[PDB]
Design a protein around this nucleic acid. Structure first.
Ligand SMILES: [Mg+2]
Ligand SMILES: [Mg+2]
Ligand SMILES: [Mg+2]
Ligand SMILES: [Mg+2]
Ligand SMILES: [Mg+2]
Ligand SMILES: [Mg+2]
Ligand SMILES: [Mg+2]
Ligand SMILES: [Mg+2]
Ligand SMILES: [Mg+2]
Ligand SMILES: [Mg+2]
Lengths: 213, 53, 87, 13, 224
RNA sequence: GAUGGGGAAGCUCCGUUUCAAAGGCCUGAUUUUAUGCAGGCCACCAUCGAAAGGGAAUCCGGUUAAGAUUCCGGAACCUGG
RNA sequence: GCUUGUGACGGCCCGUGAAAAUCCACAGGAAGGAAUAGUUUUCAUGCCAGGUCGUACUGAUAACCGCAGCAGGUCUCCAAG
RNA sequence: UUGACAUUGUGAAGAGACAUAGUUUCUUUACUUAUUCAAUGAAGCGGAGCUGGAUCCACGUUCUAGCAUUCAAGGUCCCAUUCGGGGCUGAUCCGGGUU
């Protein structure tokens, strides 16, 4: 039989992401000596829109601890973070919205975002707009933290994994009807070639197993 | 074209003349002085608190 | 013709510093000084030291690049290399 | 006069 | 001096730029350096069978110095002075020479024929199978042997870069007493002293962090 | 799309900064051991890809069978030294 | 009034609408520099040089493609009453 | 998808076989050295401080869109004082593991 679109998408080709207008990959800082032992202060210089992403991003400038220069990082903006705000990242950072802390240093019920799955991977969980991770509890003997993910799942991760206090900005985006194939067109033009979609039943049996009749 | 003109056309006679404007320069001067004074105050207060503690 | 790069022609090519001369000769500083004394190579003063040293005012000993290039062909340098191998 | 090899001297000061 | 002031630097976290420090522990070395260091570490870590581990017991400094002092008097003839002998023999047309015997096959044959009075075996031979059988052969043939450190040292003994083995077969009358005393000294210091310990397995050593963790666990288990 | 590497019997394939010892600069009479180079500093990757994207700087008058912001006359400008 | 350039604005997005070569400036002050003599080629004037390749013409009911000097096809600028 | 074999190593405890001297077999529990995954600027890892404060900490950084770079100033031993140059410290020690 003919190769279906689901199988065709694996070769790449015309199904790759449209990434010309992106601001850069959104990551935390590299887990270094300063964040492992104390804290480090950066400054929010601007909050910008990223093409293909619902949530805004924040440019945060830190000082290089080993060289006289500045380092720019792209964080995912939590709600309430403003330009000119000071952000503190490390084990000794305070419990304020926008700060980056290890999961073992926050109490139960804390709401975090851009949470590391493993210590040092620079953010993996609760990154989309309006989402967050809830700190359910701690297991100090195994140095573990139990958290609740946006999907409702319960996970156990390292207490050295880092997370940003607060909830990802831009929530409530999907509550507005698009009303228009044109608005869907402009939505997916900045993401990838997955729109419009043709139903398998409407195809021939050669094109799709659902075809025929 | 900036390589063809004199330094008068590309600067003004002030600190950060060119790269920064007058109001921003004034604000950073004020911030520098006030924060340095506050640092001296905080160091004196911390030394007194260490002595009393 | 495309636009040329600055600090490549004029004083910058006419004069060469002592460290650059030693590096090009691939000898030690003592060997370089002895070779200069043997061949009568003497330091020179550019009229525009900032042009010759890319805007630096630091004190520097300059030589003629042609003089160093002529010094590259001296057999006493090969004799020095042979003595090093013998040692 | 002319060079036969890549490295020459020709002895002109 | 009123013009000079004390301005200490804060090198803490979130403070002034860190100063230069010796980062030799964190150097990303070339791959050959890393390979040789990890190879030596692995040889230390793994449990070594006794036939290989016996080569880590060598002569001590004093006995090695005495042995090489004896052998340097019988250091073999060089190519420069051999031509001086050939011209002298041509004019006549030479006494019996005494020299250190070397070469692996030659020395093994001398040991098998019981002609070698003393054998010196280098410890750092790669591949090791070239000499791993030599102590047992010397023991079976009743030939006194000693493991010494440095095939380069044996090479300097026999006018080579390296030498896997050296052997003293015949000696002069002025040195027979010294040779007998050296044989007795090697018997006391190397054969009898290391007789039991060479039958054991080697390389039972952990790493630094592993040893620290094991010590901490043992201390915690013994005492709260 | 090469190199360092790694696949493949192989024609060749992956990958594009990694998994590499991938290269430049400053100082020196280094307390002299006597004719052997010592002390330091900064660091990331070839090349190709637009005569509509980016980009140093020129205009007027005249001239030919057919050239023309290019020739001629006059008047400018840029780049490098 | 027409065409066009431009300025301050306003509306729109679950769309917020390139990169790099290159140039300038700032912060810093390693340093260098005058008394009978120095400094400043980011002020003016004066001197020298600018290589290689393209450049005619058509661009269409006859100069391109459609077996043709084929009512077909083929991107764009200017534009009077 | 499931099972076997090879890669495949090192200990402790409990049960077996030479008939109550340690040569092997089976479970449980450990270890790292093969192998596997990830990151970096292979920069701060592990252990200890007759180091200090109160088993834990660095009391070197949290009102502020400032600034932080020239082997680091200072302190202390020398030099042959002369434009300055060296040593210890500032900035604890040790490791045969970049994390
Ligand atoms: Mg149909
Ligand atoms: Mg390829
Ligand atoms: Mg190109
Ligand atoms: Mg163009
Ligand atoms: Mg014409
Ligand atoms: Mg002309
Ligand atoms: Mg024309
Ligand atoms: Mg035409
Ligand atoms: Mg045609
Ligand atoms: Mg045709």
């Amino acid at each position: 039989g003919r190769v279906i679109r689901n199988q065709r998408k694996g070769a790449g080709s015309i199904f790759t992401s449209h990434t010309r207008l992106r601001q850069g990959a959104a990551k935390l800082r590299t887990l270094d000596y300063a964040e492992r032992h104390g804290y480090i202060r950066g400054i929010v210089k601007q909050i910008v829109h990223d093409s293909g992403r619902g949530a805004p991003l924040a440019k945060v400038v830190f000082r290089d601890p080993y060289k006289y220069r500045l380092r720019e990082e792209i964080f995912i903006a939590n709600e309430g973070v403003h330009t000119g705000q000071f952000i503190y990242a490390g084990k000794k950072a305070s419990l304020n919205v926008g700060n980056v802390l290890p999961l073992g240093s926050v109490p139960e019920g804390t709401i975090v975002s851009n949470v590391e799955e493993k210590p040092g991977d620079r953010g993996a969980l609760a990154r989309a707009s309006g989402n967050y991770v809830i700190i359910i509890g701690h297991n100090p003997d195994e140095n573990k933290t139990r958290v609740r993910l946006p999907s409702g799942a319960k996970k156990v991760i390292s207490s050295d994994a880092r997370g940003v206090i607060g909830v990802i900005a831009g929530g409530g985006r999907v509550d507005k009807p698009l009303l228009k194939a044109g608005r869907a067109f402009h939505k997916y033009r900045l993401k990838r070639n997955s729109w419009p979609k043709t139903r398998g039943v409407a195809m021939n049996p050669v094109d799709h197993p659902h075809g025929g009749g | 074209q900036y390589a063809t003109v004199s330094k008068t056309h590309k600067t003004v006679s002030r600190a950060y003349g060119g790269s920064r404007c007058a109001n921003c320069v004034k604000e950073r001067i004020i911030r520098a002085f006030l924060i340095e004074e506050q640092k001296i105050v905080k160091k004196v207060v911390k030394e007194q608190t260490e002595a009393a503690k | 013709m495309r636009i040329k790069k600055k600090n490549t022609r004029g004083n910058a090519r006419n004069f060469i510093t002592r460290s650059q001369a030693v590096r090009k000769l691939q000898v030690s500083l003592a060997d370089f000084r002895r070779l200069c004394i043997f061949k009568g190579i003497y330091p020179r003063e550019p009229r525009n030291k900032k042009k010759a040293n890319k805007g630096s005012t630091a004190p520097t000993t300059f030589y003629y690049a042609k003089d160093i290039q002529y010094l590259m062909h001296e057999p006493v340098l090969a004799k020095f290399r042979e003595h090093k191998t013998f040692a | 006069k002319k060079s036969t090899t890549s490295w020459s001297t020709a002895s002109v000061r | 001096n009123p013009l000079t002031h004390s301005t200490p630097k804060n090198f803490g976290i979130g403070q002034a730029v860190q100063p230069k420090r010796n980062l030799s522990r964190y150097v990303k070395w070339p791959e050959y350096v890393r390979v040789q260091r990890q190879k030596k570490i692995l040889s230390i870590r793994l449990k070594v069978p006794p036939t290989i581990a016996q080569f880590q017991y060598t002569l001590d400094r004093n006995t090695a110095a005495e042995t090489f002092k004896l052998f340097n008097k019988y250091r073999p003839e060089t190519a420069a002075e051999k031509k001086e002998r050939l011209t002298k023999e041509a004019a006549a047309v030479s006494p019996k020479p005494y020299a250190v015997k070397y070469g692996l096959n030659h020395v093994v044959a001398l040991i098998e024929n019981k002609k070698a009075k003393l054998v010196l075996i280098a410890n750092d031979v790669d591949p090791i199978e070239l000499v791993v059988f030599l102590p047992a052969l010397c023991k079976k043939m009743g030939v006194p042997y000693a493991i010494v450190k440095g095939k380069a040292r044996l090479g300097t003994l026999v006018n080579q870069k390296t030498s896997a083995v050296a052997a003293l077969t015949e000696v002069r009358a002025e040195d027979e007493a010294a040779l007998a005393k050296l044989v007795s000294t090697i018997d006391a210091n190397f054969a009898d002293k290391y007789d039991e310990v060479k039958k054991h397995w080697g390389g039972g050593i952990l790493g630094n962090k592993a040893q620290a963790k094991m010590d901490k666990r043992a201390k915690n288990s013994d005492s709260a």
